[PDB]
């Protein structure tokens, strides 16, 4: 009950970032030391490099913190098989890259525990949805 029970939901890359964009005023206002979380989160850098990982900060009844890892984002996993870094400016109207359903099969299994839908097929369409928004062409 003391301090804050509340949890702070953000996303950060593989390389430890002290700065403000994601963590700074998402950790500072919670009242953590930050650099401590630059000697912890690196446990989730060696395995998954380059791409981004949604982290869930959980400040309990005590002051201390315990990081809870999640599966990387959809649109971020949708730009390893597209050999690009930045997404498009005007989607559908003008696409930039092209991906294949074979790579979607992996991502449709890689995000299975997080997405509510219990089926193994519905989590293909919803990814082809994130593609339309991104701005790329798909082949089955």
């Amino acid at each position: 009950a003391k301090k804050v029970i509340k949890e702070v939901k953000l996303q950060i890359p593989a390389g430890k970032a002290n700065p403000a964009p994601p963590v700074g005023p998402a950790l500072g206002q919670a009242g953590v030391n930050i650099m401590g979380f630059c000697k912890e989160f690196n446990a989730r850098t060696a395995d998954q490099a380059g791409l981004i990982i949604p982290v869930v900060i959980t400040v309990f009844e005590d002051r201390s913190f315990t990081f809870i890892t999640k599966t990387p984002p959809a649109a971020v996993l949708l730009k390893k098989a597209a050999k690009v870094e930045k997404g498009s400016g005007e989607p559908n109207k003008t696409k930039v890259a092209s991906v294949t359903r074979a790579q979607v099969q992996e991502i449709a299994e890689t995000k299975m525990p997080d997405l509510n839908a219990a089926n193994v097929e519905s989590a293909m369409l919803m990814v082809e949805g994130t593609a339309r928004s991104m701005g790329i062409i798909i082949q089955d």
């Binding site: 403000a20 005023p25 206002q29």
Partner: protein, 205 residues
């Protein structure tokens, strides 16, 4: 004016009436110009002048040039391409004295350079400035000349803003030119060109 509103206005939908006729404009306009660094001034476009202007019209003019007499900078635009420009310029100054424009920092911009082949587009010689209002390079250059005359009191300073008071980072992103943005564990450290007015507000940092 239209040039500097295309380039350096948050709302660039709003351009003034321009045409190749005598006395196209008759009413002052005022437009906010926000430089890419975030320095802010107002750019005001007035009635034109013409030789032997009736001593009755002159009494009315005084009301329009109320902003020019109260201006921080005065930009005198001459048509360099025309033969009678030294004639036009002196006739203008003589009128301004009658209107009551006194002791105001002046910049004699010579315009329509493109109409000539000899002269180059952007040049400066003190108050003298040669440029073409049609061209962007000319304006980017005129902008720099203004930034030299208005924002002199703008000097460099270092600040350390804890993460809890982010709002202050936003103020520095919006109301000052950031040179470098450094990030520490305790808070954010940002060094910028700010005004004396900001060096009272952010003094604690």
């Amino acid at each position: 004016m239209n040039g500097l509103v295309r380039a350096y206005s948050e709302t660039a939908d709003k351009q003034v009436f321009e045409k190749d006729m005598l006395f196209a404009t008759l009413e002052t306009s005022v437009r906010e110009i926000v430089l890419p660094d975030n320095k802010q001034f107002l750019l005001t476009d007035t009635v034109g002048f013409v030789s032997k202007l009736p001593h009755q019209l002159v009494k009315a003019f005084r009301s329009t040039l109320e902003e020019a007499r109260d201006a921080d900078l005065l930009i005198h635009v001459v048509d360099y391409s025309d033969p009678h420009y030294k004639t036009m310029m002196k006739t203008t100054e003589e009128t301004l004295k009658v209107v009551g424009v006194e002791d105001v920092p002046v910049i004699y911009a010579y315009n329509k350079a493109d109409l000539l082949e000899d002269e180059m587009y952007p040049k400066q010689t003190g108050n003298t400035i040669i440029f073409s209002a049609r061209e962007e390079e000319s304006l980017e250059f005129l902008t720099e000349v203004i930034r030299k005359e208005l924002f002199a009191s703008y000097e460099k300073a270092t600040f350390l803003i804890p993460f809890e008071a982010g709002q202050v980072v936003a103020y520095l992103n919006e109301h000052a030119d950031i040179l470098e943005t450094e990030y520490l564990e305790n808070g954010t450290q940002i060094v910028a060109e700010v005004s004396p007015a900001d060096l009272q507000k952010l003094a604690e940092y």
